[PDB]
Design a protein around this ligand. Sequence first.
Ligand SMILES: OC[C@H]1O[C@@H](O[C@@H]2[C@@H](O)[C@H](O[C@@H]3[C@@H](O)[C@H](O[C@@H]4[C@@H](O)[C@H](O)O[C@H](CO)[C@H]4O)O[C@H](CO)[C@H]3O)O[C@H](CO)[C@H]2O)[C@H](O)[C@@H](O)[C@@H]1O
Ligand SMILES: OC[C@H]1O[C@@H](O[C@@H]2[C@@H](O)[C@H](O)O[C@H](CO)[C@H]2O)[C@H](O)[C@@H](O)[C@@H]1O
Ligand code: BGC
Length: 752
Amino acid sequence: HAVSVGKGSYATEFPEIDFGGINDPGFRDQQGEPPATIYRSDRVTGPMQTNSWWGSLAVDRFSMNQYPHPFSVRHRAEGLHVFYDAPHNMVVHENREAGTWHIHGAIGTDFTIKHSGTANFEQAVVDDYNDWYVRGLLENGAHQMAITYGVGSPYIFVEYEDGSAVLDFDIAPDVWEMNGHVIGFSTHDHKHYAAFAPPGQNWSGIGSKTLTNNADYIAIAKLPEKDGNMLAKFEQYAYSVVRDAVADWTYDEATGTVTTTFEVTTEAKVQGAPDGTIFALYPHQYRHLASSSENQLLQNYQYEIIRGTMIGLEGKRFTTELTYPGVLPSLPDLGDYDRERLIGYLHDATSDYPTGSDTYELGKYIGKLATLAPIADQMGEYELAEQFRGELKDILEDWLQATNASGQLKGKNLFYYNENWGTILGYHAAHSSATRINDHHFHYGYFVKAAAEIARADQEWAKSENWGGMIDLLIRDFMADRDDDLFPYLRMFDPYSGNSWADGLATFDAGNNQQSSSEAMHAWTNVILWAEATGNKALRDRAIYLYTTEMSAINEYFFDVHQEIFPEEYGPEIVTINWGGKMDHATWWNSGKVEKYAINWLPFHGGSLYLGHHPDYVDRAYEELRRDIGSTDWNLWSNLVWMYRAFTNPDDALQQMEASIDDYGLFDPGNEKIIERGSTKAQTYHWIHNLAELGRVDPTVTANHPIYAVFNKNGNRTYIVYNFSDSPITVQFSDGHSIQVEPHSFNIGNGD
Ligand SMILES: OC[C@H]1O[C@@H](O[C@@H]2[C@@H](O)[C@H](O[C@@H]3[C@@H](O)[C@H](O[C@@H]4[C@@H](O)[C@H](O)O[C@H](CO)[C@H]4O)O[C@H](CO)[C@H]3O)O[C@H](CO)[C@H]2O)[C@H](O)[C@@H](O)[C@@H]1O
Ligand SMILES: OC[C@H]1O[C@@H](O[C@@H]2[C@@H](O)[C@H](O)O[C@H](CO)[C@H]2O)[C@H](O)[C@@H](O)[C@@H]1O
Ligand SMILES: *[C@@H]1O[C@H](CO)[C@@H](O)[C@H](O)[C@H]1O
C-alpha cells in the first residue's frame, strides 16, 4: 500500500483519513479524490493532463465554455458552439460596495458546427492533445465529429465519420464571398468568419440559417477583417490540420537568454497542403519575437480578446526570446537595521505556528521558517537558525513518509498517488487540492522552499536516497519533464498562454483561472534553488524556463505594465484573477482592498525581485491602492504593502513600518492587520532595510551563473551572488563587472 522513495514513501491506496474529530462537511469533503470518470478515448493513455485551458472536455460529459483564443467554444449534444466576443459583447463593471471589478464578454453562439447524421451526441471526449492544442471527439456510435482547436489558433479543424458538415445559425448569416468550396461570411452582428471544404465540395443553403457541405472535412477560421485577400491567405493553411505542437526551449546560461520555439506538425487534407499553420500570438509572445521569426508576421492580422490584441504569423514555427533575471536563496545582510532589534524579531518568531493542518496552511508556516533561517545565520544566531531548520526537517520527514511506526498508512500528513489521473495528493487537503487537483504549485512550492533551505545547509539530507527522492517526486507532480511514467508534462503550465492554470478540472464557463501568480513564481524559484543545491542541471533549467516565461505573462495580463491591455474604463491597476475568458479584481475568498493587490505579491522571498522590474508600474499600482484606501491605514497585510512600496520608495516604506510594525506583539492568528500570517516582523524589517541600502532592482544586468541579483542606487550598482558549490566560482556580469565567491556563501553580506 506504499512505495519507498529513499527514506520516505507515498501511499498507493487511498488512506483512511484521520478527520481529527472535525465534523464540518466542507473540511471532510476536501479529504477525497478527483473524479472517477475521465472523458478520454482509448487513444489517450497514461497519466492524464490536468490544469489546462481545455480541461472541462475531460471532466464534463460534453464540455463547459472554453477559450481557444481568438474563439470561445463549447461542446454540446447538438455539436460545437462557436462564439467570438466583439466589442459590443464586452463589458467592464464595478461593484463599489464589494470593491470588485469585472471585465468580461458573453456566453453566446455565433453558430454551431454540426454533423449531418445526428444532433444527439452521447459525449465529447479528449481523443488527443499536445503542448497547447486538443482534439475533442463528439461520439454517437458510427457518427463521430473530431474537432481540433487551440489557444493561438484562428482555425478550428473538423473531421467527420459517417456524415458531412452543417453550420447552423439562429439568424441567417451574410455570405459575402462564395467560392464554391470556400465561403466568407458574417454573423447578423457583423462578426467575420470563413469556412473551407476540399475543392469540388460546394457549400449549399446560402441565404438560409443552415449552411451545408457534403465533405467529411471542413475548417472554420475567424477572419481579422471582412477581406477577401485575408480569406485567400487563410485558404492556404485551411487543409493543414495540426497533429503535433511542441514548445521547445533552451537556457543560455552565459547570456541569461531563454529561447522558446513553438512548432507544429500538420497532416494534409488536400494534395500539396503545406506543413504549417497561421498562429495567433499573444502580447507576451510577439513583444519578444525573435528576429528570425519577424518575416513570418502577417502585419494587419489582428484579433481583440480579453488579453489585448493577438497578431497573425504564418508557417511551421516561431521563436520567442526572454531574459532570466536570476534568483537568490534570500536577501543578503546589507541593510542598515538595528541588528539587536532584528535579532529580537527572529526570537519572537518562535511563537508562530501553522493555522491549519492542510498542505497550504502547513506550507505557509514552513515557508515562514525557511525565510527566517538565513536571516538568523546572517545575524550570528546560528543556534536559532538550526532550530528553524530542525523544525523544517521534523515536518518534512513526517509528511514525506506515508507509513507510521507500525508500517500501516497514516491518516494525515502524507502524500498519495492517485493512479486514475496520475497525481500526488497531500492530506490534509484544502482549496480542492485533492478533489479538483488544484494549486499543486502553490502548495508544494512551500515544501520545496523548506527542502531548499535545508539543502543549502545540509547536502546529505537532500540526497536522493535520503529525503531528496520524495522532494523530487513532489516537483515531478507539478512540473514533470516529457515521458514521465507517473505524471503528465508540465502539469501546471500552459506553454503558449505563458502562465500556470490553478484549477485541475477547468469546469467553469470562463475556462481555467489563476489568482496568485506570485505563488506560482515562488514555486518556480524554489525548484531553481533546490536543483542548484542538489546539482540537478536539467531540473534547474526547466524551472528557469518556467520562472522566466511566467514573468512575461504576469507583466502583461496581471500588471499590464505597458498600459495596452486593460480597458481605459477599468479602474484598478491590477487584475487579481485571470481566466481564459475574463479578468476580475476580486478574490476567491471574502477580502478587503489590499488583498486584491497583494495576493499577486506574496510571499516575499529571494525570487520576488521580478516584482520591481517596472518601477513606474510599482508606483502606479501603489498610488491607486493608496487612493482607494484613502490613506496608508492598510485594511489588512500592512507589511506586504510596505515591502512592495520599498521597490520604489524605501523612505516611505520605512516611515510606515516604524509607525506601525510594533502595534501588536507576538503571533496572533486572528489579526493580520499589520503582519500577514505567512510573513514575520523579522522578514519585513530585513527586507525594507536591505532595499533602502541597495536601491532599485536592476534588470538591465545579467550574469553567467543563475543565482544572483543586481541593484542600482543612483547609478551605483551592488552585485549579489550566492554560491551553492563546494568550490569557489567567478561570476561575469554583462556590464563587464566580475567577482569571486567562496563556497556556500554570498559574495557580500554573509553577516556574522
Ligand atoms: O471577492 C469577491 C467574492 O468572490 C467570491 O468568489 C468568487 C466565486 O464565487 C466565482 O466563482 C464563479 C463560479 O461560481 C462559476 O460557476 C459556474 C456555476 O455556478 C454554473 O452552475 O455552471 C458554470 C459552468 O457551466 C460555472 O461556470 O464560474 C465562474 C467562472 O465561469 C466563477 O467565476 O469566481 C470569482 C472569480 O471569478 C470569485 O471572486 C467569494 O466566494 C466571496 O466570498 C467574495 O466576496
Ligand atoms: O495566503 C494568502 C491567502 O491565500 C488564500 O488562498 C488562495 C486560494 O484562493 C487559492 O486556492 O490558491 C492558494 C491556496 O491554495 C491561495 O493563494 C487563502 O484563502 C487566504 O486565507 C490567504 O490569506
Ligand atoms: C483566508 O484568510 C481569512 C483570515 O485572514 C479567513 O477568514 C478565510 O476563511 C481564509 O480563506
